[PDB]
């Protein structure tokens, strides 16, 4: 019966504002203490703040990373909790949950990034004897500093698919993405076979074909 409908939130430059709202049903919201909790991608739960019921004074508490910057209020006539996010930092990027912390909403995503469209830099990860275990050599391509997702990587125009492993991108503190694609091949074909990675970054209309050669 309890419902917590989050809304608001999206992209925003650092230093901007965003208001989140949490609509509640199934419990007398006026008599309830409400909290905000956030979770950065791949990270843990971090308490943001709490407002207490207007019966108990209705004053607010805040975690240290959001003091002076975030404001929590409530319109318990409309059964709505608010999180006023000012002075946004990229470190605020997280899914934001409103809680009563027994019950949890589904969360809204807030992404704070100064990044804009940028094609990747592609560098070869050349096979050496320090890439070779057994008779198998590892070679790849480093796909550096692009935005936004996604990037597609094929090898030899898709004719080489065995032993190919493209790794999910890391999201860097700079707001740009980096990505690696590696392929394992017989070391005996480094002298006989040409290896080229094809990196396609459609958001920037960029495609890069990088030849990867033995050291």
């Amino acid at each position: 019966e309890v419902q917590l409908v989050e809304s608001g939130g999206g992209l925003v430059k650092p230093g901007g504002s965003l208001r989140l709202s949490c609509a509640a049903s199934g419990f007398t919201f006026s008599n309830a203490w409400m909290s905000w909790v956030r979770q950065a991608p791949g990270k843990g739960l971090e308490w943001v703040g709490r407002i207490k019921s207007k019966t108990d004074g209705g004053t607010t508490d805040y975690a240290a990373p959001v003091k002076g910057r975030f404001t929590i209020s409530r319109d318990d006539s409309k059964n709505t909790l608010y999180l006023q996010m000012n002075s946004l930092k990229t470190e605020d990027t997280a899914v934001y949950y409103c809680t009563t912390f027994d019950y949890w909403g589904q969360g809204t995503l807030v992404t704070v990034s100064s990044a804009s469209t940028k094609g990747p830099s592609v560098f070869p990860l050349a096979p050496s004897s320090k890439s070779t275990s057994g008779g198998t050599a590892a070679l790849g391509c480093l796909v550096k500093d692009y935005f936004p997702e996604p990037v597609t990587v094929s090898w030899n125009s898709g004719a080489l698919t065995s032993g190919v492993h493209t790794f999910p991108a890391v999201l860097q503190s700079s707001g740009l993405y980096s990505l690696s694609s590696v392929v394992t091949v017989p070391s005996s074909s480094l002298g006989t076979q040409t290896y080229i990675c094809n990196v396609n970054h459609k958001p920037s209309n960029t495609k890069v074909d990088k030849k990867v050669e033995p050291k």
């Binding site: 508490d61 949950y97 949890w104 320090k130 790849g140 480093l142 890391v170």
Partner: protein, 213 residues
């Protein structure tokens, strides 16, 4: 205060695990302790509250306890089911705060465990000649999907310039991950070696590269 949990826990269906949660400052009995279950892509569920209480709809396989001896709260799950595979967070109240544990990844084993394969690439000379330097550490084929990655410059732990992905499930149902260390060309050449250290189920694979090899 902080609440410290083990990074990950794993066991087979039907067996029993326990996740601990140690309070750093102040008494653990001082304040109520709650436990939340978080499945992939899902909002958290309260599974234990007020130290040992189960909300309605939570099976008695889930049990919570307190040990003043080690200033620890613990969550225990008997007869593990597939649906128990999730991340588990403890949390308690402070003199006016709200503290969450770091979280614990619980894997319900559905295939044999598998050690990570680690391949470390030095900076390409193409990148070095563009005044950049990135060390690429590729980790794949490990199960359960829970690793910690550390870096070393010679023998010293690297404290900045490290970006690491969370584990991603590959098509063979094992997991992959990536760590990157950014340097300038001067830093790269001024050290005898750099190391990527991958810890998986209490054991570590270290790969080293050197500007001279």
């Amino acid at each position: 205060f902080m609440l410290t949990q083990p990074h990950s826990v794993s066991e087979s269906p039907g067996k029993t695990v326990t996740i601990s949660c140690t309070r750093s400052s102040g008494s653990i009995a001082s304040n109520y302790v709650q436990w939340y279950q978080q499945r992939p892509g899902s909002s958290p569920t309260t599974v234990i509250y007020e130290d040992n209480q189960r909300p309605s709809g939570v099976p008695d396989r889930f049990s919570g306890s307190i040990d003043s001896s080690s200033n620890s709260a613990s969550l225990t799950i008997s007869g593990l089911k597939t649906e128990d595979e999730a991340d588990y967070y403890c949390q308690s109240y402070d003199s006016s705060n709200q503290v969450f544990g770091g979280g614990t990844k619980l894997t319900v084993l559905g295939q044999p465990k598998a050690a990570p394969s680690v391949t470390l690439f030095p900076p390409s000379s193409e990148e070095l000649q563009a005044n950049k330097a990135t060390l690429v550490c590729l980790i794949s084929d490990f199960y359960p999907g829970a690793v910690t990655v550390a870096w070393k410059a010679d023998s010293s732990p690297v404290k900045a310039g490290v970006e690491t992905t969370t584990p991603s499930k590959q098509s063979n149902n094992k997991y992959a991950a990536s760590s990157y260390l950014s340097l300038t060309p001067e830093q790269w050449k001024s050290h005898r070696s750099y190391s990527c250290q991958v810890t998986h189920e209490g054991s570590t694979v270290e790969k080293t590269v050197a500007p001279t090899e």
